[PDB]
């Protein structure tokens, strides 16, 4: 297949059908470009990538011209460099003199390529003046200065194809062509803000980040995104103590250089409602207290109420790190209590997927392989909200092949076409044995996706039993070279909590009226019972319902202020990196548990991260391999699928309502982010409004 070609004397071996620019980029030759992006459809309009081919008079758009065999490609002829300076002299003909006031200042491709490939002088002193355009208003997240657009259509190609938001396009003709939405309406996509990164010029910039920093000030720290369970790789930029912006970074297995609008514009919640001093409840208000006084009060309060063996309850929040989970799990068992669980809304005491077998509560197919899946079945999942970036991955497959997606649950407005089947367990029951179930078995690598919201229904066990019954009796679904069962998580500390077994499987214990409740970042306990005679401690970084109920509050650090371990939905183990310091006297999250133990007579053996990181090897030896997935062996997986199948289960016929009823308010940082408040007002809880009432 491969065609051997030489670019400027460098031999190139690439796949056939590739374009010249990919061949040149592999040989190391740098070909300037504006309109070509390696995740978008090819348009050939910017005319900057022009090269010379030996058997032609006509310059070739190397981003569009497919590769040949034996072809000789030139890139550094004086003829080409004349063309590059001509094109540069055209883009800057109408470009405004905005660089000082332009938020793209130190990181603009029109600057660096013009500096490198253009002339050093301009020949435009015309008296009529430049072209001026009116800025279009497309929401509270994207700040448009359309004077600066170079008409490269990356915004159009991304939003139409990747994002699935067809309201953005080119309206007009020639010198009056105006990228926008023609009529005034806000752009509605959870991935709409990735256009800010694609727009090479200052035409589309961040509105929350407007005018606040220059790119040479910021310090770039590579960490992970924990607003949803995918764990998308991000880049956090800090100017001293503050975190200024969050951007995606390349990881072809998880996020593929995109992050949802929740991930990047929730950075401003880290400066608001923070817990900075330990607070002790006195009367009906809180007062400041030192770590000596606050730790003593918890130690004193614990002995006053004297919770018994299993009357001590530990609740873990969505954002909580894995090191604090094991620190807390060890601490409570050191007091001899197993009433340890999460703040979710699960129904059955042993969660339907359980914690015994990893293969029953992860994304066994791995995200990088969703590309090659033939048929996908959605069970009660709304990826447009639960895992936004994963949804765009499924669309990209469905656009380039004959993938057919089947959905069972509550109907939602989706980016790609669905084949709706029903909205209850019985609807899924006929579908598995019917025409659609036949489709999956005939396919090579079919996919069954179960959402996180399946558990929060009354029929949590029926669906897991039903689907497993189909899986337990097939050969295509589970092969040596394929594991077709997948579970989609949405809270960033589920797989971490389940990998360490921070979940109680005793129904009587889960019903025990616990007296001492230790809230570890749990902020959704409205349904959870908290008796008036319970002494509650909340250790978190944000003031919300979890801290309001507490009697002593111990400040903790956010994911941008500590080194921690997170396991995403597909089982990959990822460790964050510290970008700033926690504010005030706030301490590390697992350090509090160690220090709290010394006051409670349960002194934990750990003394530092490395000692605690040795403990993660004990609970599960795979928790020491960063960015490495340990797939479940095929034989042992089939054991777990069987124990989910249980005769004698009644399908109550409950609608598989999605758990995310507000896309922007899902975690603690999101609820305290001023920018997310604007989005709900402008876009709505489900990103459905097309008009911005809030406009001033």
């Amino acid at each position: 297949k491969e065609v051997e070609l030489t670019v400027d004397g460098v031999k190139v071996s690439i796949e056939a059908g590739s374009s010249i620019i990919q061949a040149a980029e592999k040989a190391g030759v740098t070909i300037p470009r504006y309109c070509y992006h390696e995740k978008l459809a090819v348009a050939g309009n910017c005319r900057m990538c022009l090269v010379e081919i030996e058997r032609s008079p006509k310059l070739a758009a190397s981003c569009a011209m497919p590769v040949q065999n034996g072809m000789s490609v030139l890139t550094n002829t004086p003829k080409i460099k004349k063309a590059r300076e001509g094109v540069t002299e055209m883009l800057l003909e109408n470009h405004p003199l905005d660089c000082p006031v332009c938020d793209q200042g130190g990181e603009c491709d029109l600057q660096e390529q013009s500096l490198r490939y253009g002339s050093d002088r301009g020949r435009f002193h015309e008296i009529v003046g430049k072209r001026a355009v009116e800025n279009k208003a497309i929401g509270p997240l994207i700040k448009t200065s359309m004077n600066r657009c170079i008409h490269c259509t990356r915004c159009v190609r991304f939003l139409n194809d990747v994002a699935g938001a067809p309201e953005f396009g080119t309206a007009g003709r020639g010198n009056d062509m105006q990228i926008g939405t023609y009529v005034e309406r806000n752009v509605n996509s959870e991935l709409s803000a990735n256009v800010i990164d694609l727009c090479p010029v200052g035409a589309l910039t961040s509105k929350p980040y407007a005018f606040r920093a220059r790119p040479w000030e910021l310090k770039r720290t590579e960490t992970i995104d924990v607003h949803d369970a995918l764990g998308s790789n991000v880049r956090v930029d800090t100017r001293g103590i503050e975190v200024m912006r969050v951007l995606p970074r390349l990881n072809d297995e998880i996020n593929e250089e995109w992050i949802s609008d929740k991930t990047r514009f929730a950075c401003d919640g880290l400066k608001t409602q923070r817990l900075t001093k330990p607070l002790i409840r006195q009367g009906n208000t809180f007062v400041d207290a030192t770590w000596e006084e606050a730790l003593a009060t918890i130690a004193e309060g614990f002995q006053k109420v004297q919770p018994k063996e299993n009357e001590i309850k530990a609740i873990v929040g969505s954002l909580t790190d894995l090191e604090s989970i094991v620190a807390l799990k060890d601490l409570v068992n050191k007091l001899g209590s197993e009433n340890v669980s999460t703040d979710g809304d699960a129904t059955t005491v042993p969660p339907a997927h359980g914690a015994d077998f990893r293969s029953n509560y992860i994304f066994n197919s791995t995200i990088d392989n969703i590309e090659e899946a033939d048929q996908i079945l959605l069970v009660g999942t709304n990826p447009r909200h639960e895992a936004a970036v994963l949804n765009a991955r499924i669309r990209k497959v469905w656009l380039r092949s004959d993938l057919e997606v089947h959905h069972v649950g509550e109907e939602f407005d989706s980016t790609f076409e669905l084949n709706h089947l029903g909205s209850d367990v019985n609807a899924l029951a006929k579908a598995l044995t019917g025409e659609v179930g036949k489709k999956l078995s005939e396919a090579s690598k079919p996919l069954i996706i179960i959402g996180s919201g399946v558990t929060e229904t009354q029929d949590a066990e029926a669906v897991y039993a039903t689907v497993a019954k189909f899986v337990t009796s097939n050969a295509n679904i589970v092969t040596p070279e394929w594991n077709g069962f997948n579970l989609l998580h949405r809270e960033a500390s589920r797989v971490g909590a389940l990998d360490v077994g921070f979940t109680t499987q005793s129904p009587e214990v889960a019903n025990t009226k616990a007296k001492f409740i230790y809230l570890l970042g749990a902020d959704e306990i409205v349904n959870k019972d908290i008796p008036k005679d319970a002494f509650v401690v909340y250790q978190g970084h944000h003031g919300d319902l979890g801290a309001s109920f507490a009697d002593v509050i111990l400040p903790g650090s956010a994911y941008t202020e500590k080194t921690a371990t997170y396991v995403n939905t597909e089982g990959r183990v990822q460790s964050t990196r510290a970008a700033t310091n926690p504010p005030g006297v706030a301490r590390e999250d697992w350090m509090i548990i160690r220090a709290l133990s010394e006051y409670l007579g349960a002194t934990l053996p750990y003394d530092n991260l490395y000692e605690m990181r040795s403990r993660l090897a004990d609970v599960a030896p795979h928790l020491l391999r960063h960015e490495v997935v340990e797939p479940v062996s095929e034989g042992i997986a089939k054991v777990g699928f069987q124990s989910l199948v249980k005769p004698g289960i009644q399908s109550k016929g409950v609608l598989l309502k999605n758990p995310i009823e507000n896309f922007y308010f899902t975690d603690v940082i999101s609820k305290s982010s001023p920018t997310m408040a604007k989005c709900v007002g402008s876009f709505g809880s489900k990103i459905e409004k097309i008009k911005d009432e809030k406009a001033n």
Partner: protein
Amino acid sequence: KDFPTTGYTEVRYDAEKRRVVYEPLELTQAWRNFTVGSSVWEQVGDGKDFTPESFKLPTPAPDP
């Protein structure tokens, strides 16, 4: 290269000891590293060949 530009320690006059003493480094304004915002594109090409034509190995000419 591994030695930081601001060094490790600094001196001040201690009243108790009546003498100038060394203390560990502590900057009131931490140094700002603007060097991160360097060029992401290569700025100068491969150069030009200026070897004398008397110091290059001759190309063996093709045969008839």
